[PDB]
């Protein structure tokens, strides 16, 4: 309906009114318009809203035909896109270069966009979440503009969006489970009992692939409206709630009783996210209920846990 070219099939706030908002300087109420305003996946706000969140973390605003195909040039030595998929940099995870609903040409954008990313970015060495990001961008608006969107992201000096070396891969999933461990005890306080000798480590090592492997694509497009303007802890809320959502569905629901689910409970966790029993706003009502997610508090369980 209103998607980007490259996609295949399957009173509410406006653009203007963000914009002016945000210029004013006024970021918490455009957060909470994020949060609480469900525009349907075919709106065509997001074609105009996304870049703008995203390019709000850069001081420096970056136009159309700018620098990124001067890149591709010096990448490829032609701006004419491959047919036959390209080799992709080795920063990303081969397993999960989620294309999600990307025509084999909005695949082969992709491809571009992120060899270009690795080409102008030689300090990111592993950022398996990055692919993934690229192709939802690229479902409401052209290459150019998703890759503006990306070095936005990638280059934010205070706010985390994107990780992009395997130390900060390996604090922040750390991170993710001494949180966990005080909000959501209980849920895997469980699958140690159901599952003797389970490494909680395995599990929290597959965190994102909850939210960006395993839910619905519109529960992602409402998720990311938050998280252009959040940063990474909207995706910790949400990780949290999964969890919780899931220890609940244990208890009453056939088909994730012990048995069915104590063999790999990781894989367990991604089935229930792809049949998720919650709508995408009922999701984010219990994400942005959850407390004690300071910025603070996070920044300091973090260097916690890098110090040791």
């Not at 305003?37 to 159309?64: D, E, V, Y």
Request: glycine share 4%.
């Amino acid at each position: 309906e209103g998607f980007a070219p490259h996609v295949e099939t399957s009173a509410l706030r406006s653009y203007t009114e963000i914009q002016q908002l945000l210029q004013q300087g006024k970021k918490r109420d455009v957060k909470n318009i994020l949060r609480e305003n469900s525009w349907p996946i075919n709106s065509p706000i997001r074609a105009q809203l996304w870049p703008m969140l995203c390019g709000q973390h850069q001081t420096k605003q970056q136009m159309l035909d700018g620098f990124y195909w001067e890149m591709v040039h010096q990448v490829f030595g032609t701006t004419e896109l491959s047919e036959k998929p390209i080799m992709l940099p080795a920063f990303v995870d081969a397993t999960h270069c989620l294309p999600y609903h990307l025509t084999s040409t909005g695949r082969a954008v992709a491809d571009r966009i992120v060899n270009v990313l690795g080409y102008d970015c030689p300090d990111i060495t592993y950022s398996p979440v990055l692919y993934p990001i690229t192709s939802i961008l690229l479902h409401f608006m052209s290459e150019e503009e998703a890759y503006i969107c990306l070095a936005g992201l990638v280059g934010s000096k205070e706010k985390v969006f994107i990780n992009q070396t395997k130390l900060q891969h390996e604090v922040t999933w750390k991170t993710v489970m001494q949180i966990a461990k005080k909000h959501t005890k209980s849920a895997t306080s469980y699958f140690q009992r159901i599952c003797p000798g389970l490494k909680l480590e395995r599990i929290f090592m597959d965190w994102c692939w909850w939210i960006l492997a395993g839910l619905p694509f519109q529960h992602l497009v409402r998720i990311m409206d938050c998280y252009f303007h959040e940063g990474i802890k909207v995706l910790y809320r949400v990780a949290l709630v999964i969890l919780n959502l899931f220890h609940k569905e244990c208890q009453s629901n056939n088909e994730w009783s012990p048995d069915n689910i104590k063999n790999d409970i990781g894989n367990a966790l991604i089935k229930f996210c792809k049949k998720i029993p919650v709508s995408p706003a009922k999701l984010l009502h219990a994400a942005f209920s959850i407390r004690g997610l300071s910025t603070q508090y996070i920044s300091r369980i973090f260097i916690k846990t890098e110090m040791l």
